[PDB]
Amino acid sequence: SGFRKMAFPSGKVEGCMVQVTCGTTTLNGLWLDDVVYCPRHVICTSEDMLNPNYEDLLIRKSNHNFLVQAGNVQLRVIGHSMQNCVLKLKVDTANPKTPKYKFVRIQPGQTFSVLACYNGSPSGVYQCAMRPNFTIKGSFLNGSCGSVGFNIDYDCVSFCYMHHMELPTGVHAGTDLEGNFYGPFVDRQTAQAAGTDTTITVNVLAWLYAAVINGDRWFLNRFTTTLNDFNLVAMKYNYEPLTQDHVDILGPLSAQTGIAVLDMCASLKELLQNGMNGRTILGSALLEDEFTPFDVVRQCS
Amino acid sequence: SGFRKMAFPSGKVEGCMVQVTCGTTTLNGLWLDDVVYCPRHVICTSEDMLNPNYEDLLIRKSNHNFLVQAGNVQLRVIGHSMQNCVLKLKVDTANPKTPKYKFVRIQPGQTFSVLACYNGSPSGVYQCAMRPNFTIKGSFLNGSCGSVGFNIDYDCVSFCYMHHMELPTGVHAGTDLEGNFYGPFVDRQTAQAAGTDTTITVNVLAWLYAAVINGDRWFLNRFTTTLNDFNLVAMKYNYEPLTQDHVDILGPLSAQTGIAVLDMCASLKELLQNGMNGRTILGSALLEDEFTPFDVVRQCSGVTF
Ligand SMILES: O=C1C[C@@H](C(=O)N2CCN(Cc3ccccc3)[C@H](c3ccccc3)C2)c2ccccc21
Ligand SMILES: O=C1C[C@@H](C(=O)N2CCN(Cc3ccccc3)[C@H](c3ccccc3)C2)c2ccccc21
């Protein structure tokens, strides 16, 4: 019993983190096989960051200008190449600790573990969700760039996120491992603002299922509702529309608890209209939306 | 910026987790050097567990009856031993992945990372606190016994917790690595009273400093208070009394934010008397006591291991 925000064990990713230094810029790189992946803004200087032309900088650089260090050992850089907002440094030695891995692009709502890193060393691990507005509410300081987010299935590490920047808002923007930004952000020191965020409805519901499993049942009510009636209420309270895909995804949890999805949706509606009343669910006085249906099942299995 | 419940990187510990099997019972063990540590209830049967005579049960066992599987290879057991509520299996081979490590007994109020494991394989990691009443509020299922809690300082892993049981209440109890229970608990399948819990006051204050550091300042007040006055409020709301030691531990955070401890205490008092008021502090509608002053600095300093 119990429910906690739980990250994947970070051992496999730890063995891939390196430090990448170019001129005076240092950040974190991800060393898989014979390739080192990192944010392209490592090739920049301060002055360039307000209006950088990355095409020119990469040609003005050579293999030897890139210092790659795995722990205390220097990797030798064979070649360098740019893909979107990520630089790929070919190195002379394959990473002996390289796990089975995939690169994946996650959708808003999906969760992952972040291993926050400085100078190629790990500081800590926490769990995050990709918000609908395509930001993440992380914990990152100067030098955290190149830190990565991931999921682990058995032995396979699916990398989904590399950290690039903090917005003036204090939220966090970054790319997939192909170097494409999540959301509309760019790697410049410009205005760029994140859109108004929304609550991930399917996740909240999963959380309510998790509460029921753990003996929190007070919010359960005798009402039922319809997907349409419920979406009307979701819209009012800035909640993502619930789809039939969502309802299907909640089937296993519905089955386990014997509470039909639309009945749980009626509980939720009531919680949105009446609030918490000063009660708590699973130790929280707010509705939590950073656990997927998969996370709730995983955690109960 | 931002502030999250951050666990330590769990690599060093992952390589120490093994499966221990004895008869039909399987659980997790911790393999350091040439010794494997697990809960002694590994020797028990579901019958025995209401009133186990551990000495007698252990006698019926020989070290050949203890199967330790690291990943997929079996280790050979030379000698077995019971220490308090832990069993120490002497094994053939020193663990090649043994980190620099210590065994420590943490205090109520201190935090640690838990690596939840099943069948000697790690499932996830989360940060929690040793409650004043010596319980933890974890996430643990059948098979999670022998999962460990730890802190890391640079290269050194300080093991402080091994998981033994879920109480009927649904909270978790366990031992240090010498097998001594935190709290009044025993490894028997009996209902057992956890005492009344308290909020860890020093930690809430540390969290308030963390909030100010991240731009959440709304709770900051024009008032101030006294240690005694504040402590009368603390006792009303089942908060731990604040001592001068706690004030001193908060000194660095006080200096960074330029906000005196007793001023922050006045803030806290007001939050206790008037509530949150539908607002949030660092994304929570409750006062969080699961961050020490050392954890706040760690996260805001960005220390690595
Ligand atoms: O989460 C973090 C990441 C980090 C951070 O935001 N940095 C780091 C530096 N870079 C600039 C740079 C590149 C080369 C040389 C000199 C400066 C990033 C950047 C990337 C793209 C557009 C604008 C800025 C911005 C940061 C700083 C303070 C607080 C929290 C966070
Ligand atoms: O967090 C968990 C840990 C786990 C759990 O509680 N177990 C596991 C078995 N053991 C007994 C056993 C030993 C050998 C053979 C048969 C039974 C523990 C125990 C230890 C000491 C006193 C009483 C019970 C109790 C558990 C089960 C369901 C839900 C959540 C949790």
Swiss-Prot record, chain B:
Compartments where located: Host cytoplasm; Host Golgi apparatus; Host nucleus
Catalytic activity: TSAVLQ-|-SGFRK-NH2 and SGVTFQ-|-GKFKK the two peptides corresponding to the two self-cleavage sites of the SARS 3C-like proteinase are the two most reactive peptide substrates. The enzyme exhibits a strong preference for substrates containing Gln at P1 position and Leu at P2 position
Means of activity regulation: Inhibited by pyridone-containing alpha-ketoamides compounds 13a and 13b. In turn, alpha-ketoamide 13b (tert-butyl (1-((S)-1-(((S)-4-(benzylamino)-3,4-dioxo-1-((S)-2-oxopyrrolidin-3-yl)butan-2-yl)amino)-3-cyclopropyl-1-oxopropan-2-yl)-2-oxo-1,2-dihydropyridin-3-yl)carbamate) inhibits SARS-CoV-2 replication in human lung cells. Inhibited ex vivo by michael acceptor inhibitor N3. Inhibited ex vivo by compound 11a and 11b.
Enzyme active site: 41, 145
Cross-link (Glycyl lysine isopeptide (Lys-Gly) (interchain with G-Cter in ubiquitin)): 5, 90
Top-level division of the source organism's lineage: Viruses
Record's function text: Cleaves the C-terminus of replicase polyprotein at 11 sites. Recognizes substrates containing the core sequence [ILMVF]-Q-|-[SGACN]. Cleaves and inactivates human TRMT1, preventing tRNA guanine(26)-dimethylation of tRNAs. May cleave human NLRP1 in lung epithelial cells, thereby activating the NLRP1 inflammasome pathway. May cleave human GSDMD, triggering alternative GSDME-mediated epithelial cell death upon activation of the NLRP1 inflammasome, which may enhance the release interleukins 1B, 6, 16 and 18. Also able to bind an ADP-ribose-1''-phosphate (ADRP).
Description of how the protein assembles with itself and partners: 3CL-PRO exists as monomer and homodimer. Only the homodimer shows catalytic activity. Interacts with host FBXO22; this interaction promotes the proteasomal degradation of nsp5.
Name by which UniProt lists this protein: 3C-like proteinase nsp5
Lineage: Viruses, Riboviria, Orthornavirae, Pisuviricota, Pisoniviricetes
Residues of the full protein shown: 3264 to 3568 of 7096
